[PDB]
RNA sequence: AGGAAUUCCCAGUAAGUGCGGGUCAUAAGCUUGCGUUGAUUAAGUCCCUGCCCUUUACACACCGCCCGU
């Protein structure tokens, strides 16, 4: 009788478009796909994107731990890496490095994250090289 | 077997 | 060799089916005079005072499951086991509206107050709301997980509340088709749900003695409404709640369990509640003089009071209430409807018109005018044409019965070893003969008008003759096992009996000597019949096969599959070698004994068929089934051709490049339209994707394009659409959405149209916005990933440092190494 | 100089021309060798008419769940 009540609130929170409040419940209910859809929906909305990192601080400790293991799967897929990288950026700058070591499964999390994140950096480097073609077009326009 | 099952 | 078709003429002997609900109807301005009762595949309108059928509403091949009368009174909604919903006009008697959204039996049907919307529940876990006036289905609700028990509208805020066989109560916002509130209180099925006190209290019935109530107040935070546990009221019945009903605009709440008694409750509201509270306070003040919150608590518990409960003869299936004195109509397992009057006394019954149990034996008179049907505790005689019960006699039980050649008398068999005889005119039992020790199973009439033969559970077979009418026993024939069927030849030469062992033994009538034996059935033979010539005898067993045997030598001509279950009865037509059989597979079939062919199938009944009878003229056939109904079939003049009947059962986008063009054109048109609309202040495709900007709609078109087909679609696109795409691409990068996809598309167009872009001076502003945006956004994304370099790499080194402290060192080094060796395939 | 319908055909191929043999089967107004002359169009799609398969070797790069009874 508990989950169906929690599910009813989660089904509600999506309906009035309250994605910020939906972050806590979906992480607590352990739905990685639901969180991923909400994270994408937050970023497209302009005002919600800036208040994203403020929300992440208010979450308790264990929600951030299960959240971290969600980003491991998301960073694997190229279509889903950008939403993962934005989230992983928040954890690094906000929280203390020694506290990151205190997390459970952080050692196993670091093993998977490094190779796939290295792949994304090389792809963006090639795009930056291709972006220089705009400067060549500007000088050749009359 | 009895007729009660089969017929009735 | 041409055959003739048999067609179902009428259905009789049924008052009310066990499944369904009884409803009061308004005809000719009399609210309580007429009632609507469900039968097998039909629904009947009865007059309680007169006792006759005013009107019958046609059905099609499927049983009716539930009934709902329209608020206006002109229409009544009908639900079927298939899932189709049909609405009938009472005055015309013809229904032309069909709703077939559901895929299972329609459990409930309810109307709103106005009558424009209809809500239906089914065993499939769905609720569908229909537009009655427009004859269309509005929307489907899919929240529930089990069968739907109840569905009720709310007038005040356009809300629907539903209950199901699952332990949940769900609240729906019909405007958005969203389930906003769910109750999890109950432990078991929520069988009942009613609204009371002007939609301020909620009452639920479950499979327990306690009956819970909630109070609702309009406005995990609650939304729209809130509900609190007001309390519970006790029930006398200890069983499950079958039904909860409240009469329209009344103060009477009726609770019904599996037992026969119906429980009534009366609510106190408005001044009556206030007057009772004032009286209680004065009595409390008098008690204080002789020698409050408790008084208020006493008032709350006494808000609803128990009036005297109605008791019925048998258990009730459905009931209805009307209040101007309370009138309550009932439907029982017996096809019997009763009305009781209370402010209890029984005012009327419609017990005439059907047997109280399933008809086990069935017979015709010597002429075709009369039809005999007998069951447990009742015997009735039916006129074939006029179709009303001529006379009724009580009996101990019915298993077999023949009609004596005299038109005045009848003879029946019983489960107890007895025989009873009656006159039709006198309507009394003549005498009772202890014919057999055990159950008497079969009875056969002599070819000549004198005498008859009985066989039964007692292993002997006894011969009787007629002697005011009386019967005496001439001689008896004793056998080794039980006797299933006795039937002897159209000439008085040969006698055929069926035993419990899988054999049919033929005896000479004159000498009582063995003549023949028929074997080969895996299961004992239930039914037997002998042709008019006497050449062929057909035997049917509990095993599905039916076999034809010749009397001359006992040779088996044929064995047929026939029904899918055990065959119950078999009988030849009088004129020719055609016989009718009925089995437990819901069917009646006729066969040609000479050609061993299946000619016809009658598909009227909905349950297993107990008995069958054919007229001596052969024109009419009557059958009885587990469903409490009797059906009549008649021969028609239209010829039947076999192979024409045999075939009756056999019968019974746009390319990626073009998509970009339409998206751009749609964007061009709308931006002009919004410009005009704003000036006045001083499309359907967009709502299809949800309300979004026209610039947004172009984006998902690009996302929908497959990666492989991306490059040639851009090559195909003409330069006319290119400047617009560059403006739209700039808008995409600034939002930051799908930058990798857009930049890959953007860089391709610039290369292929490099020369033409350079010439056009109109594009000079465009790339200046593009040049500043593109590098700024791409660098930002790369920096975010690049910042993750430092944090992850540093945390990697810290974990490696901790492992160094532990380094037993060889064991730890071996254990540490062992983790980091993955395995790959290699062709050596 | 052979209608309607219909059949076959991509390089020494289509078509024309001559000269032999009758070979343990077949072949007589027919069968099979051998040489001579030698072209037009086409080297790609699943639109029609059909056929064969599939929809559970982790370099880089790419890609990211067939559906129903
Ligand atoms: Mg020619
Ligand atoms: Mg030649």
XYZ file of C-alpha atoms in Angstrom, chain A residues 1 4 8-9 11-12 15-16 44 82 85 89 92-93 97 101 107 110-111 113-114 117 120-121 123-125 128 130-131 133-138 140-142, chain C residues 168 178-180 182 184 220 223 736-737 740 747 750-751 754 757-758 760 764 767-768 771 775 778-779 781-782 785-789 791-792 794-796 799 803:
78
model
C 0.000 0.000 0.000
C 0.991 2.732 -4.897
C 0.279 8.098 -7.238
C 2.234 11.156 -6.093
C 2.251 10.150 -11.399
C 0.835 13.468 -10.175
C 1.348 15.838 -14.637
C 1.635 19.373 -13.221
C 15.149 22.007 -22.076
C 25.398 14.984 -22.161
C 28.091 14.803 -17.829
C 29.863 18.031 -13.048
C 32.601 17.098 -8.462
C 32.456 20.845 -7.792
C 36.617 14.909 -2.800
C 35.583 8.543 -1.546
C 35.565 2.631 -6.769
C 35.178 5.225 -11.404
C 36.312 2.171 -13.397
C 33.284 6.278 -16.121
C 36.864 7.051 -17.214
C 34.095 9.913 -20.766
C 33.274 11.777 -25.499
C 36.116 14.300 -25.158
C 34.400 13.402 -30.278
C 33.907 16.984 -29.079
C 37.491 17.839 -30.060
C 35.593 21.953 -32.466
C 34.970 21.229 -37.765
C 33.533 24.404 -36.210
C 35.063 26.044 -41.024
C 32.664 28.865 -40.084
C 35.610 31.251 -39.703
C 36.875 30.264 -43.161
C 33.438 31.017 -44.636
C 33.302 34.473 -43.016
C 35.491 34.413 -48.045
C 32.071 36.100 -47.966
C 31.921 39.343 -49.935
C -8.330 -0.124 -4.832
C -6.203 11.471 -15.165
C -6.309 9.417 -11.957
C -5.392 11.884 -9.216
C -6.289 6.306 -5.038
C -5.662 1.660 -0.383
C 1.588 13.627 -0.360
C -5.642 17.320 -4.724
C 21.662 23.764 -26.480
C 19.436 20.922 -27.701
C 25.903 17.246 -32.198
C 28.497 21.675 -41.550
C 27.891 24.823 -45.794
C 30.354 22.672 -47.747
C 29.896 27.028 -50.277
C 26.392 31.127 -50.122
C 29.415 33.394 -50.651
C 24.508 36.169 -51.684
C 25.985 37.956 -44.405
C 26.467 33.445 -40.463
C 27.630 36.253 -38.163
C 29.766 32.020 -36.193
C 32.103 27.949 -31.426
C 30.720 23.711 -28.719
C 33.547 25.000 -26.514
C 30.139 21.474 -23.986
C 33.759 20.374 -24.428
C 33.459 17.180 -20.291
C 37.003 18.511 -19.973
C 36.332 19.584 -16.395
C 35.258 15.998 -15.678
C 38.769 14.936 -16.729
C 37.825 15.281 -11.027
C 37.581 11.685 -12.217
C 42.187 12.723 -9.362
C 39.658 10.464 -7.627
C 41.171 7.589 -9.610
C 41.773 5.098 -4.777
C 45.455 0.174 -2.245
